[PDB]
């Protein structure tokens, strides 16, 4: 009895585009 995945994997989003987006918000006028 082999153990295959139940359903397909669901993709994740890396937490490095967060510090890309904040660094790109820093170029713009204001975050708030």
């Amino acid at each position: 009895t082999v153990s295959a995945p139940a359903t397909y994997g669901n993709f994740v989003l890396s937490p490095e585009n967060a510090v890309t987006a904040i660094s790109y918000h820093s170029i713009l006028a204001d975050f708030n």
């Binding site: 490095e16 510090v19 890309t20 660094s23 790109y24 820093s26 170029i27």
Partner: protein
């Protein structure tokens, strides 16, 4: 005798970036150094009238 009178330093005038007129020509931001802005040049989609 010889009279060694008072001694004098020189008060050099400090000068800051943000207190200068060149600071209006920029958008100076202290920012913690990352690799992500350096590994990639930016792209800009500017709309033309």
């Amino acid at each position: 005798f010889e009279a060694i009178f008072g001694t004098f330093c020189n008060r050099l005038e400090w000068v800051y970036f943000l207190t200068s007129g060149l600071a209006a020509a920029a958008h100076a931001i202290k920012f913690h150094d990352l690799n992500k802005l350096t590994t990639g040049k930016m792209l800009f989609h500017v709309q033309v009238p």
